[PDB]
């Protein structure tokens, strides 16, 4: 599914546990101009390869911490995948193809409230109704 | 500090004269204020138009004995 070389480190005990085989698993891919040393989110030092890299991780936050670190190495082509135990690989970051800090067309407003927050109703007005005060 | 330094007479000791007044208003003779129920000439003692405070001798007997917790001396 995913093409890449595992970075060079002698293994840690901070890697990925039984949740990977039973619940969900993440992968990060990036390419590097040269081979250089980076820090794992699990702890420890590892050498990335000159070329395509692949590093399986337990949480998505590990991949976004690593992708924030890879920007210091001037590497902005990183991709984060979500892998299920069925083998289902889905592409989540960046999902649109553009990083979320930049505006891209085709994105819609999700969970936008067209009022200020002091204009939310009282909790007693929404009591027993099954809705929250901040809904809609 | 003043008791630690061997001089306990330099303490700030304040009498609770208001709650002692209330105890003297109930007939407690120990403070010597001679007020409402501790004063036998008072209108509250005699209940002047009707004289029907039947509770009062047993009450003063109970409050003026020092052998109970009924308005302890403060």
């Amino acid at each position: 599914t995913l093409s890449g070389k595992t970075p060079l480190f002698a293994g840690s005990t901070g890697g990925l546990l039984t949740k990977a085989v039973e619940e969900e698993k993440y992968a990060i891919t990036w390419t590097s101009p040269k081979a250089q040393v980076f820090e794992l989110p699990t702890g420890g030092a590892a050498t990335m390869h000159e070329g395509e890299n692949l590093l399986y991780i337990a949480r998505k936050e590990y991949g976004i911490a690593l992708g924030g670190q890879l920007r210091k190495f001037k590497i902005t082509n990183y991709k984060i995948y979500r892998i299920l135990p069925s083998g289902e690989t889905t592409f989540i970051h960046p999902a649109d193809g553009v990083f979320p800090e930049k505006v891209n067309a085709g994105r819609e407003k999700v969970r936008f409230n067209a009022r200020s927050i002091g204009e939310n109703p009282n909790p007693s007005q929404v009591k027993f109704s099954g809705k929250a005060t901040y809904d809609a | 500090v003043v008791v630690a330094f061997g001089t306990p007479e330099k303490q700030i000791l304040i009498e609770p004269v208001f709650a002692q007044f209330i105890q003297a208003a109930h007939g407690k003779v120990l403070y010597g204020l001679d007020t409402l129920l501790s004063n036998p000439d008072s209108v509250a003692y005699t209940a002047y138009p009707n004289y029907a405070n039947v509770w009062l001798p047993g009450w003063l007997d109970a409050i003026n004995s020092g052998t109970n917790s009924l308005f302890l001396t403060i």
């Binding site: - | 500090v1 003043v2 330094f5 061997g6 001089t7 330099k10």
Partner: protein
């Protein structure tokens, strides 16, 4: 570091100065078993001259526990 060593040296020479001027050190040398080491005479203001206890050697003051007296006798 030099400023801090200056602080520690002021502290040390101050302890030695209290042993010089305000102590029963010479009375302690004559009888180490029956004289309690004391520097720091306390000024009498608010009844705190009770703290100047009879430590022996004809002296009244706070009995010290740092062992400067034993250090100086060993010196």
């Amino acid at each position: 570091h030099f400023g801090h060593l200056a602080v520690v040296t002021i502290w040390l020479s101050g302890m030695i100065f209290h042993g010089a001027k305000f102590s029963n050190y010479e009375a302690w040398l004559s009888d180490p078993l029956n004289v309690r080491p004391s520097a720091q005479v306390v000024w009498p203001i608010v009844g705190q001259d009770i703290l100047n206890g009879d430590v022996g050697g004809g002296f009244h003051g706070i009995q010290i526990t740092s062992g400067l007296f034993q250090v100086w006798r060993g010196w």
